[PDB]
Amino acid sequence: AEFPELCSYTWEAVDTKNNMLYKINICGNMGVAQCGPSSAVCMHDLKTDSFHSVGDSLLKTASRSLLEFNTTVNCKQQNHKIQSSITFLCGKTLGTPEFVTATDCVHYFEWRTTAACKKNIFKANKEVPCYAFDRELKKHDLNPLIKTSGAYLVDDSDPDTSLFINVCRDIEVLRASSPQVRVCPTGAAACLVRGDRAFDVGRPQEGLKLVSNDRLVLSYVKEGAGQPDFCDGHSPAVTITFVCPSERREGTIPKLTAKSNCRFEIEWVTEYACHRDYLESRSCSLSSAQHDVAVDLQPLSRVEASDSLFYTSEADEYTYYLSICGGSQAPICNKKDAAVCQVKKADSTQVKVAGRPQNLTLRYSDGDLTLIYFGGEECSSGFQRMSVINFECNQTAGNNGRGAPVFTGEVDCTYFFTWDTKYACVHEKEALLCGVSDGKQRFDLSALARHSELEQNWEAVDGSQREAEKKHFFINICHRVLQTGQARGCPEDAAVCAVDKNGSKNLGRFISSPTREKGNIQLSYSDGDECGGGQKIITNITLMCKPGDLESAPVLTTSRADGCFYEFEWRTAAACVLSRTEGDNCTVFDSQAGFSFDLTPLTKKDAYKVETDKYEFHINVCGPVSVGACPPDSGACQVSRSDRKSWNLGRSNAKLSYYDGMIQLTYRDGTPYNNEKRTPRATLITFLCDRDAGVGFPEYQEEDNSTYNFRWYTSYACPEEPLECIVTDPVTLDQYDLSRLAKSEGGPGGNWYSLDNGGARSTWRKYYINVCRPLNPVPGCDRYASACQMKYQGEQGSYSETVSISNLGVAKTGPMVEDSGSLLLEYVNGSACTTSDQRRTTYTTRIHLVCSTGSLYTHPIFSLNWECVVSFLWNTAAACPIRITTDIDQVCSIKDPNSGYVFDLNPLNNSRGYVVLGIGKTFLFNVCGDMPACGTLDGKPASGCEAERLVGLEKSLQLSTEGFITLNYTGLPSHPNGRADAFIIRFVCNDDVYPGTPKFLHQDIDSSLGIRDTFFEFETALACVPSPVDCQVTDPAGNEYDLSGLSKARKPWTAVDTFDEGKKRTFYLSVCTPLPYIPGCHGTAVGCCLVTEDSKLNLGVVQISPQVGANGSLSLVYVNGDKCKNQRFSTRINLECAHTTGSPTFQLQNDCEYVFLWRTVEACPVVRAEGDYCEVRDPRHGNLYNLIPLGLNDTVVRAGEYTYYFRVCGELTSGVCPTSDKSKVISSCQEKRGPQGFQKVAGLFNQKLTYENGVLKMNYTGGDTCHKVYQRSTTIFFYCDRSTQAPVFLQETSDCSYLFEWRTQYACPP
């Protein structure tokens, strides 16, 4: 019959408004027929559950593109039937029959197929339905993800094999992109391509189902004979599972879960799997709370300067004049004010209104945009003459991107128009993938997709010359930019967004997939907002690999200074090479995200239970299931439900394998199943990420007596959930970068630990913390919890000193910028806590970052543990704003103002010079202005050559504090009293490199008058800031050692080398900070540089946290040297406290270990010494912290509403609240404004400051009653700085105790 590939299935059509699911089938073979036999259209009203008979398929008629179903049952209007009408248009896919509108007794349907396309050029041989419908009649349509040219590569860890699926139809093999997808057999859909040979694995049998939770399933199966020899007697079949990505489920590429026979199994988390948008509206410009769909038909009424501002459709017998969405009509209708009006070609006088612009319905049904009119005229039956218009997503349209309406198939005075246009052409959800392929090696940028979660997108820092008018750059890596805080009112279908006071700006669109370029991943956004000359804003995010660093943000590296181009650069982790990694003790170490998935929280000792109709599976992660029916070492065991006969599905296995957000536990061997091959029963459980699913229930899915395959929606199979330690101040626009204080696994381990002493050996609560991540594995305290409180279980036994648990909080917020230029970082929703038990809740962790522009070392200090809020205090370098700090003077030495690091490019001062071979242009080059091989100009021998010799140049460089250093040379000709030829060099970090050579990045010559600049970037080791270091190290016993003093060095630490033959060599050495710029050394980070013979053995890299030992002892090993007999190196510095401060002495040498014994006073454990009046005597340095010069004034601090007077070391004199007559010796007051200004008494005078590991805590206690029990204390923390004594109120801790930090000069050890 008509439309031959449309009979085999039953098609469903929802009307979202009324909730009436219409079930259609063309030739009338319906299985759900409670309605009449051979039912064409069976209306199922969902709330009355009525099954009305709308179509008799035996009375099916036809028109040019139009199936009518004219039933026998009479309408409540006489001589009318309950008609239905299915209009047929061309898509690229089979589609689904969307619901246009309906009066009481006709129902109109748009249905855009391949079956309507009678030009079958590259036709689909087998094409199944691709839509589902859950209980509430919400749509899972996936038609726009059907690739009609080529196949989606399915990401597995096998470099040799490659599966190539194509959703809901056979793979177009002929006109395809890849060389190995042309090899494919015809009519295949799964196409395993093994070693220049493509098998037909999957064939489309049945259209996709919704069987599970909300995830769709779709199964391909190949039946018959001629199975490959891979399958070992199984039919090849591929089941793809379509998941919708929420905040819980991350990915956007299809992943191969089970490759353990020709039964393949794919979890594909696509945005199209999500509930498809049904948003209709009144005249034009439909939009909803979901701001992904953007329609406006004003540009179909706002006609170009070209003539005939109305449209004309060329029709059957008589042509239709029409002007939609409030445009000037045709003069042939004269005076109708009709947005469409039909015109008779017999007589120009008989004109009938076919639509009016009072009654519209611009309906966006499931990607298929429709525009309906109503109440045109009366026709020959009694039907109001209405008219529909079906828009098509036709990009390169005629009439300057508007296109013309074609008329298709009038029924019952209802005119169906099809319209190829661009201003009704939406990408609603992303169809494009975010994986690439460097031939073999795959990548996945799905982690850094903030994917329609409506939780804030990324904010790009300005590393690059922002000016006065500096803006918020809101990128989103793989999606339309999320409409959230500070990004709402942005033009939607933008990927990067530029927003200011003046207005938001589109800054590129996700037009094309990512591409692997130049040893990184480029991500080019074309088609942005309009720049100067009708050029659109391009944007090139270069996502680079950095292992474990998901918490960074894109730096803005360059611009073009005319707003046509903005290049970003992201030192991320989700743009690093995917690899299979394997784990032994039920712990698999993720490499490309720096996570370590332990699944021992899933080991239930009493069994799990999966129940299908035929079997009961008792399965257990990383351990034997205890059920007496099965063999004892059973990892999994199916018992029947009728026979109750056991079969052992593989013996106990603790071997996990992680690849691309799924952990495969395979269980196999065990008990065979009575075949002459003696094939053992194996099963494979796939743990894959669901951030709020707990331990999870495993699921069984397959369809034969076969090798069994489970998936397990864990919470513990999940990476860090990148949350971007970056905060932009709203009122100023100062970005702060905490993304280098994120300590990640794979490195030397460690955490940000901070002790609390107070009372001896009880409430020694040693608090671990980590910034914007989960913790590292630290035994016993939680995973996915950023801070855990490890108390001591030590009864003074040297062996009996260990740590045990509390669980403080999970990083979801990211840093928030607080008052007085500090920034607060909340961890909400920890473990259940004890308090004043009026309300017990989850723990929180407040950590306040106040910045000291000191040295590279950073150690957190413990503020308070108060009413389920553990406070903290970051004295770091990274908490200060982003500064670029250009130096026009001497060039190959630059100091970072925040970190205090010195980038020296003196080993890049190559006296032979660097040759940059360019594009038919030789650039001879050197960085410190050395190379006189070219023109030695007036005081400019500065290495400026485009070869025959361009110029000698004036020199300047800048840093950014965020992975950007550039040297902006400028030649002697300032070109015609304008700007000059100023050609630029850029730095980035390759860790494993020598000093190196340039690679010639693009030159950009634009003679505006005389401007040109030739950028040539080069990867060197001397280019990026080392991560802030924890030079303070604990031991298991609780002695808190601190070597931060040994890293403050005026000259780098030498060593008395007097032992080994009394040689004339030196031995440079450091502690927890790399050695500075000793020439002829591997200076990326070096522990100790030996100097002799110009044979400079660089014999160790800096170990951040040294090894521990006995009472008052450390040991520090530098592990990664050079060139010694299958050993890199080792240098042991025994940091053994005596109480001199001598030089680390050369002890002896053997087996390429150079060993030193450092008698320092830094190697003594930190003791909290409590001081006298204002002074602390001999706190392990033998110095005195006399802070009475800060008691010479009333010190006013402020909050927003509150005010906090106090006075260091005695006797606050004036206030609003010296309102007492007692012995009150008031040294504080917390205040308010005029209303509710009964303001409270001090922390009373103590004249006692306690020394805490380099902070000085002064405690003013014994105020008035606060809420219930505690008194209104105040506390001052004195940290090192050059007396920026404008106090940081440490905001929103305990409401009964106020923390202050003074960045004062007297608190510094001299």
Ligand X SMILES: *[C@@H]1O[C@H](CO)[C@@H](O)[C@H](O)[C@H]1NC(C)=O
Ligand Y SMILES: *[C@@H]1O[C@H](CO)[C@@H](O[C@@H]2O[C@H](CO)[C@@H](O[C@@H]3O[C@H](CO)[C@@H](O)[C@H](O)[C@@H]3O)[C@H](O)[C@H]2NC(C)=O)[C@H](O)[C@H]1NC(C)=O
Ligand Z SMILES: *[C@@H]1O[C@H](CO)[C@@H](O[C@@H]2O[C@H](CO)[C@@H](O)[C@H](O)[C@H]2NC(C)=O)[C@H](O)[C@H]1NC(C)=O
Q: Which of 862, 1053 has the CB closer to ligand X? A: 862
Cβ burial, residue 501 (10 Å; 0-12/13-18/19+): exposed
The token pair that represents 1114 in the structure block: 């450390």
DSSP code of 1027?
A: P
DSSP code per residue over 692-724: TSTT--EEE--SSSSSEEEEEEESSS-------
- Count helices and strands in the chain by DSSP H and E runs: 1, 88
Binder of residue 524, out of ligand X, ligand Y, ligand Z, none (CB less than 5 to 8 A by kind): ligand Y
Residues that contact ligand Y, how many (by CB under 6 A):
5
Query: What number of other Cβ atoms are within 10 A of residue 194's Cβ?
Result: 15
The token pair that represents 828 in the structure block: 């909400």
Q: Which of 930, 1013 has the CB closer to ligand X? A: 1013
Q: How far is CA 979 from CA 885, 973, 974, 1007, in A?
A: 22, 9, 6, 10
Q: Min. distance of Cβ 393 from ligand Z in angstroms?
A: 8
Q: Which of 543, 610, 864, 1241 binds ligand X (CB under 6 A)?
A: 864
Of the candidates 1135, 1106, 1134, 1100, which has an alpha carbon nearest to the alpha carbon of residue 1118? 1100
Question: Which ranges constitute the DSSP H helices of 1092-1234?
Answer: none
Residues that contact ligand X, how many (by CB under 6 A):
21
Three-state secondary structure of 763-825: CCEEEEECCCCCCCCCCCCCCCCCEEEEEECCCCCCCCCCEECCCCEECCCCCEECHHHCEEE
Strand order of the β-sheet with 555-556 is 515-517, 520-525, 539-545, 568-572, 555-556
**535 belongs to the binding site for ligand Y (CB under 6 A):** no
**397 belongs to the binding site for ligand Z (CB under 6 A):** yes
**420 belongs to the binding site for ligand Z (CB under 6 A):** yes
Binding mask 1096-1135 for ligand Z (x = CB under 6 A): ----------------------------------------
Q: Which of 567, 745 has the CB closer to ligand Y? A: 567
**540 belongs to the binding site for ligand Y (CB under 6 A):** yes
**101 belongs to the binding site for ligand X (CB under 6 A):** no
Q: Min. distance of Cβ 1013 from ligand X in angstroms?
A: 5
Q: Pick the stretch among 389-397, 465-473, 1112-1120, 1187-1195 that binds ligand Z (CB under 6 A).
A: 389-397
Query: What number of other Cβ atoms are within 10 A of residue 1126's Cβ?
Result: 4
The token pair that represents 1038 in the structure block: 């609780």
Q: Which of 558, 1044 has the CB closer to ligand Y? A: 558
The token pair that represents 737 in the structure block: 């970068």
Give residues 55-74 in contact with ligand X (rule: CB under 6 A). Answer: 59, 61, 70
Query: What number of other Cβ atoms are within 10 A of residue 234's Cβ?
Result: 16
Question: Is residue 1287 within 8 Å of residue 1190, measured between CB atoms?
Answer: no
Q: Which of 1275, 1279, 1301, 1307 binds ligand X (CB under 6 A)?
A: 1275
Binder of residue 81, out of ligand X, ligand Z, ligand Y, none (CB less than 5 to 8 A by kind): ligand X
Give residues 965-984 in contact with ligand X (rule: CB under 6 A). Answer: 968, 970, 979-980, 982, 984
Q: Which of 1218, 1262 has the CB closer to ligand X? A: 1262
The SS3 of residue 418 is: strand
Q: Which of 4, 159, 398, 489 binds ligand Z (CB under 6 A)?
A: 398
Distance CA 683, CA 1144 (A): 59
Binder of residue 834, out of ligand Z, ligand X, ligand Y, none (CB less than 5 to 8 A by kind): none
Binding mask 1220-1259 for ligand X (x = CB under 6 A): ---------------------------------------x
**884 belongs to the binding site for ligand X (CB under 6 A):** no
Distance CA 53, CA 72 (A): 9
The SS3 of residue 522 is: strand
Distance CA 619, CA 698 (A): 9
Binder of residue 669, out of ligand Z, ligand Y, ligand X, none (CB less than 5 to 8 A by kind): none
Q: Which of 148, 394, 813, 841 binds ligand Z (CB under 6 A)?
A: 394
CA 46 to chain centroid, in Å, comes to 40
**861 belongs to the binding site for ligand Z (CB under 6 A):** no
Binding mask 550-589 for ligand Y (x = CB under 6 A): -----------------x----------------------
**513 belongs to the binding site for ligand Y (CB under 6 A):** no
Q: Which of 84, 1027 has the CB closer to ligand X? A: 84
Distance CA 901, CA 1060 (A): 34
Q: Which of 400, 890 has the CB closer to ligand X? A: 890
**853 belongs to the binding site for ligand Y (CB under 6 A):** no
Q: Tell me the residue type at 1185.
A: Y
Q: Min. distance of Cβ 682 from ligand X in angstroms?
A: 59
Beta strands in 225-296 (DSSP E): 237-243, 254-258, 263-269, 278-281
Question: Is residue 985 within 8 Å of residue 969, measured between CB atoms?
Answer: yes
Binding mask 343-382 for ligand X (x = CB under 6 A): --------------------------------------x-
**524 belongs to the binding site for ligand Y (CB under 6 A):** yes
Q: Pick the stretch among 227-235, 531-539, 1267-1275, 1278-1286 that binds ligand X (CB under 6 A).
A: 1267-1275
Residues just before a chain gap in the chain (C–N exceeding 2.5 Å) are: 948
Binding mask 1067-1106 for ligand X (x = CB under 6 A): ----------------------------------------
Binding mask 933-972 for ligand X (x = CB under 6 A): -----------------------------------x-x--
Distance CA 554, CA 540 (A): 11
Q: Which positions lie near ligand Z, rule CB under 6 A? A: 394-398, 420
Q: Which positions lie near ligand Y, rule CB under 6 A? A: 522, 524, 538, 540, 567
Q: Which positions lie near ligand X, rule CB under 6 A? A: 59, 61, 70, 81, 381, 412, 863-864, 968, 970, 979-980, 982, 984, 1013, 1259, 1261, 1270, 1273, 1275, 1297
